[PDB]
Subunit: 305 residues, 6 copies
């Protein structure tokens, strides 16, 4: 009784997930009216079904989120059994954007409350900030991780002497975990006092790890700082290729030799033109997670022995 | 303790209302981040205050609505006393858009629930469809009407022998009311069997009345149909100048001599270039309504003796 | 696991539905105490069952609605699995009753909220005003239509040259739909300027169509107006036989030759004494709808090819 | 900013309260439509006001309760500041009606939830069962007592040697309290094994005390049982004169010399014809309670030194 | 799909129930941090399962209740299907504790609301005060009774001429029911004017019945009062052995020959040292109730033919 | 109309705040029953008042939290106007306690929801983790900071050459802020690879800064690590003196010369016996914050020019 629907944010990823589930996307016409309002209508029978909506809240964030909530409402009024919102990238949840006024909203809370109000039953995201936002949901949240796929790709290319360098001081726990998993290699930290790199970096291959790349910026500066001191090659691995701002003149005019990202965001054409940017796929893991959520099997058993 | 804030949809109308209230707009920086997410921060002290947010949900509808709800959340977390959302045009509430699938959402209900969830205390709209949407709100809704201003402008230009013609069959009650108010003049109906005009139209001045103009379309066709039979001049009066689609080649290539609208929507530049389109202002009525809501005075006493 | 319960509004219709489902009504003693309060007690085991309550909110409206909500509460506290309220006629939902004070409640909203609060999971009505009230429910609403049965009875009696006449101007969409379905016959409108009948009516058989008959009134006046100009016979078809006020001296002292109604309201004895009033039955359609709701089958597939 | 409104249950008591507050009842037309649905419309301006609704939920209980909730909704949608429901007698709250099925609703809970849902802010009742029902309300409940007025009337008529006799075993705490207050007189209990009267009753004046009289019944039987053994006179004092069933042939064909009740229920004409039934008034206490609730003064200071 | 979890209040009773269900307690580490906060973590996979939590809210009440709600939250965030809270003794629900200030909370309501908020779906208690507290829950409550087991143990020891004596006047209904069930024996009441025992007690065996024993106190005084007049033996039967205060010097320094209680509370060691205190077990009835709740079978059919 | 109430967690701090407000604590008897349940009763009249409850949720956490929610319920049922919960230390909110099972509750969310459910209107805490927990509250939260008082005490004792050292890597932002405020002194970090101290520490006075001290532990180890390399004196400044575990043998058997804490937790006697532990007071700041919250003045204006 599992049915898959998709919006307009990630149609390719939705098609890949549908292919790996040996099914097809549902028949729903999701489009825009003349004045810009979201138009949604369901042409299938979804009564009592187990519905999954694959809709990342990537740029344009507001249109995608409105599509998501309007589809949820249309499916809830059509007597759908359970609605799961598969959101590969959760939009209004970034923590590294704080302009100092102290009178600011909590937009992740707003989005979580609106999702719960419109009728969402479950959430399945990828690499959420798994310390804060899971408390904003009154519905169960299944957070799956893109780290295993990125790490299994890291092990493929046979780095000389890998060292994991966190691009900043906030994200050192993830770097430590990846370093421990990756053959228990060495450890390094970039600190912005200028740059204060901590550890030994000389004649090695560095692997910067992050959950996001917005405008290059911090990653490009960290790569430059640790390549000033004779790092052989610099590989930057990220899960969410937001690539806003310029992010195409920052990557080209940089010393990073390869940026590896996942396919949670469509990765617009100008980035595709770059030669040193390669994208992985989360379709297999997301399909397995969807199948296990539908059948009430252990999601955590997918990531550990 | 009344404070006024504005977003980015209607900044001119908000400034006019603030001028007529002998006050100034509050200091809130409402803008966009690099990736398109709404950024809101309040630079004033709004603790215990009586806050009004002037934000029409016009095109682009989703960005404007997200600005509105994010401002409401930011003000609610800043210990604002009461939050009133002054929405001159309510976006996802049109009834004349029905594509036949029968599995469709009720978007006005979704917007009303999200407004109530984020922390809105009152709503003040202009010319809402005052039979359905007021039941979707669990907060009080003050619906003020743009009919008195349009009618007082109608009486100014000294029509030869005015006759009120409803552009379609759904909106005949409003046409009857305006005809009764306007010196108890004659009555006519356009019916789409082709066009089936009902009543006497010959050597008179016709005044089409509607609450909205989207793409010309129905109004242009009605004007052509009733000018086939020797109508002297045709004036179309509307409250909400949505003007989507073309709405600039429809108006120019038409026989309408003057289109009079209100200022609930910014009325983009290409429409401004047209010579036969003139806009009124609702700033005085909205300012009086805001002042009466703040002081708990009779709003209905503003429109009747 | 389907169980059927009934109150005191429509016991005959409930028995007919139970007969067509090859089952029997549940054992619940629904009665009145000495002081007039509703007494409800369930003598069956309804734990985990799929419960349906057949209770029209017809006159006396308040007693019937109180019976309905008290039965819902009694079944919800008895660990019933799902409760569906089959309401053939929704009571506080009429739109053609507006006395002008502008300070009035929305009673349909009140009833919907109270139904949702007491523990109703689904609603199944017949010929609701399917543009407004479905937004007042936060539970799914299945609106089934009595039009197919009335129309299939219309086609039986072999009208000479049928023409569909809407009794007023508000309900012209339904008349147009029925005219299109009924061999694509002609079209006519009654307008109250006196009566302003639009179209050709002479030597034909007219079929007035409405969703309700309260006191004769509008239908009797329309029949008189269109029989002034040589209409052969006049048949009035309605879904809800409210028949309040007099509605028995209006029908007898009228020129309508046959009034055909459905059995959503018990149709009290004085109306039964009339010879020109004949009632159809919705028991088959309601039984099929109940069976399809219980088994999660397509309700819309019942009404279209 | 205090305004008083009334329904159709207790219009005389509402008028008395309005007279003692030196004000007048608000202008609201509360009536019935042709089909029996409650019609409510507010002809006053109640924006920001402090509204009190005086509406007992006495027989007919369902119509009165529907009037109450419809008035509450009409006032809440008219931007009323605070709504207090003054309910002199709470209807669906009796505990001495238990038919043994164990699958029964809790109707007091249903009424409390519906009152809270429709928009009631406070409740002010008289002689509620102040151990259970106050937990069913999520709004503050002010329970005032009719005991002081009944007791001050008891002390007036100069009983020979008063003894307080509880009509049954459940209500012995109230009898003990009244006996302690009434000059610390003696104590007696009626027990239904036949009747098992406990204590000394001979040559004395007995004063049965209860919060309600439904059909005579228990009180008449207790009076007969304790007058079998030479009780001089028997006075029955109650707060709520429900007087359902017969309650007019039970009182006449009884040995009770005087039944004293309050005016929370209109006390229909046949009871008025009886000579041995006298009614007190709670209008003064209710007016003082309303005035103290509006001004945020101590209600409990009204009943104690 | 049934899983059983336990806290730290009643681990022995939970183990007995798990043994009678031919299963084992789930793997959850419920403990305390250094500062006293409750630590809970689930080491099993409970996705989609039917979870039961066996946790009495006995002394220490606050720690046990916090353990219960924290386990409920941990299981709800782990995608548990349905959570049933098996609470053999409900803590904040006693009615025989009223200190006179009239400004007091309703703690049973607070606990019920917090249980409903944290995510509890059903409640299964033993010998609750089944007239008030069941209305405080918006989730179904299954109240099972320890009376059959106590009564079947009463019939075992072959009393000479049993007479059921209620320890006070409030609990006479339960005493009457047990007397009717126990061979329809005689009836007696203890009344505190000193003690006013009602009925014949001489040369008989008395069986005091209560739902609770807190500090001896009332039961010890009643036993002394009815043994002043030549009662052969006095047996006190209770369901909840709270045994607070002293309750060990009251029982030893008393004339009660045997106190029989159930195992809803762990019955601390000093009480175990007493020779005249014997405990029964509710594990069989609770296991049957759990099995019937999981399989949606009639609970009431467990207690009657 | 401001009234102050206190529980049993922090009676001294509550008395100090009441003294600085020139008022007295309200008359509420907050105690324990025999079985350990919280007993609360209000002996004052709090109708319409502006109530503040000063109750830290410190050890024993569960008893203190239950006292808090029971007082809130008792005051809400007594018609209190607004209830503000002044919680100097929020209990179930620590983030540095993560045992790895991934099936764990979010206890801060549970406490926030229960506070909102029982009827709390506002929260005023001290040095909360101001990035996560403020989103768990649907009521406004006023987070005041103990940093200004600790820093003004730091500047008093005339350190030789102060350097701020963060005890770990998570809390480096607060250390950077305090270093910038404290004459823009130098910066250092302790990193646990053993200890990896970053920066220059030799012949200086180090000032470790943290929001909490639980068991010494991390702070003692950091002090030892940075005193291995010739630090003159080591001062540890904290806001919340939890001091659980041993925390009295860790501090004595350490090289820290002075531990300065605030008075949000009663700081039990064994810690008082230590000579090198000195406590500050937040009573002035909390009194000013309470006064400004009551009068709707700017709280943020208290901490900045």
């Amino acid at each position: 009784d599992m049915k898959l629907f998709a919006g307009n944010a990630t149609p390719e990823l939705a098609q890949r997930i549908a292919n790996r589930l040996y099914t097809s996307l549902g028949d729903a016409a999701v489009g825009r009216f003349s004045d810009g309002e979201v138009s949604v209508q369901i042409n299938e029978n979804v009564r009592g079904g187990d519905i999954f909506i694959i809709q990342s809240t990537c740029a344009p964030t507001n249109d995608n989120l409105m599509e998501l909530v309007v589809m949820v409402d249309a499916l809830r009024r059509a007597s759908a059994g359970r609605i799961t919102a598969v959101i590969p990238y959760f939009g209004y949840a970034r923590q590294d954007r704080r302009v100092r006024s102290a009178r600011v909203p909590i937009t992740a809370k707003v989005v979580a409350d609106f999702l719960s109000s419109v009728g969402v039953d479950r959430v399945l995201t990828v690499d959420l900030h798994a310390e804060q936002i899971q408390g904003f949901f009154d519905v169960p949240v299944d957070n799956v991780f893109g780290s295993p796929i990125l790490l299994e790709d890291m092990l493929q290319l046979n780095l000389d002497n890998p060292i994991v360098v966190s691009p900043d001081i906030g994200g050192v726990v993830r770097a430590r975990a990846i370093a421990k998993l990756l053959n228990d290699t060495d450890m390094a930290i970039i600190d912005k006092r200028v740059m204060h790199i901590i550890g030994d970096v000389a004649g090695r291959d560095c692997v910067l790890v992050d959950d996001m790349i917005d405008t290059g910026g911090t990653l490009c500066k960290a790569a430059e700082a640790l390549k000033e001191r004779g790092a052989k090659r610099v590989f930057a691995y990220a899960t969410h290729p937001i690539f806003s701002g310029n992010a195409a003149n920052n990557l080209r005019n940089s010393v990073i030799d390869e940026v590896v990202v996942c396919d949670t965001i469509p990765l617009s054409d100008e980035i595709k033109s770059l030669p040193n940017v390669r994208t992985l796929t989360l379709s297999g893991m997301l399909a397995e997670a969807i199948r296990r959520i539908s059948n009430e099997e252990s999601i955590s058993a997918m990531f550990e022995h």
